[PDB]
Amino acid sequence: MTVAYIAIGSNLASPLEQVNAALKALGDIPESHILTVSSFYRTPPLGPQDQPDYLNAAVALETSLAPEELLNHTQRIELQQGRVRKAERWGPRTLDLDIMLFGNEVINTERLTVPHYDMKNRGFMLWPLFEIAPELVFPDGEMLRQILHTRAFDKLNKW
Ligand SMILES: Nc1ncnc2c1ncn2[C@@H]1O[C@H](COP(=O)(O)CP(=O)(O)OP(=O)(O)O)[C@@H](O)[C@H]1O
Ligand SMILES: N#Cc1ccc(CSc2nc3c(=O)[nH]c(N)nc3[nH]2)c(F)c1
Ligand SMILES: [Ca+2]
Ligand SMILES: [Ca+2]
Ligand SMILES: [Ca+2]
Ligand SMILES: [Ca+2]
Ligand SMILES: [Cl-]
Ligand SMILES: [Cl-]
C-alpha cells in the first residue's frame, strides 16, 4: 500500500453536496481506504476570477492501486458528478480531483504528473494537506511545514 493525497475542488452545482458525494465515491474506489479528510475551505478563485468561490479540501487515501488506476477512478468520479469540459482554460467545475502525491513516487506518464506540478505554490492545496499530514515530506525532501512557514500564502477560511 501507498498513501495518496488527493485535492478536492468544486465551485458549481452546490459544492458542499458535490464534495460530500465525492467522499462517498472515493471510499468506493477499490483497493483503497480513506484515512483522513481535511476541513472544507471556501477559497477565492485563482486564475480566472469570474467564477464562484471554491470549496477546497484534501483527502489521504491508502491504496494498492497503480497510480494511473487511481487516476482512472478519480476521472470517473468527476465525470459521474457531471463534470463537463468547456473550451475556456481553468473554468469552473462541479468536481476536480487532483492527485497531489502518490507516496514518495515521481510519476511522469502521458496522463499523470505527480507531484502535482503547481501544488507547492497553492495555499488551497497545501493548507488542507498540512491539516491532514503535518509531518509530510515531499519526494524531493522538502518539508510541508517548512514551505508553509517560509512562504507567504493567504490565510484560508473554512467553509
Ligand atoms: N496529478 C494529476 N491529477 C489529476 N489529473 C492529472 C494529474 N497529472 C496530470 N493529470 C491530467 O490532467 C488532465 C487535465 O486535467 P484538468 O482537471 O483539466 C486540469 P485543472 O485541474 O483544471 O488545472 P491544474 O492542474 O492547474 O490544477 C487530466 O485529463 C489528467 O490526464
Ligand atoms: N494564479 C493562479 C492560478 C491559475 C490557475 C490555477 C488552476 S484553476 C483553479 N482551481 C482552483 C481551486 O481548486 N481553488 C481555487 N481557489 N482556485 C482555483 N483555480 C490555479 F490554482 C492558480
Ligand atoms: Ca472567465
Ligand atoms: Ca486542479
Ligand atoms: Ca484536475
Ligand atoms: Ca509517449
Ligand atoms: Cl463541470
Ligand atoms: Cl517534490
Swiss-Prot record:
Thermostable. Retains 75% of its activity after heating 30 minutes at 96 degrees Celsius. GO terms for molecular function: 2-amino-4-hydroxy-6-hydroxymethyldihydropteridine diphosphokinase activity; ATP binding; kinase activity; magnesium ion binding. GO terms for biological process: folic acid biosynthetic process; tetrahydrofolate biosynthetic process. InterPro entries: Hppk, Hppk_sf. The gene is folK. It holds the Pfam family HPPK. This is 2-amino-4-hydroxy-6-hydroxymethyldihydropteridine pyrophosphokinase. The keyword Signal does not apply. It comes from Escherichia coli (strain K12). Catalyzes the transfer of pyrophosphate from adenosine triphosphate (ATP) to 6-hydroxymethyl-7,8-dihydropterin, an enzymatic step in folate biosynthesis pathway. The lineage of its organism: Bacteria, Pseudomonadati, Pseudomonadota, Gammaproteobacteria, Enterobacterales. Its EC number is 2.7.6.3. Pathway: Cofactor biosynthesis; tetrahydrofolate biosynthesis; 2-amino-4-hydroxy-6-hydroxymethyl-7,8-dihydropteridine diphosphate from 7,8-dihydroneopterin triphosphate: step 4/4. The keyword Hydrolase does not apply. Keywords: ATP-binding, Folate biosynthesis, Kinase, Nucleotide-binding, Transferase.
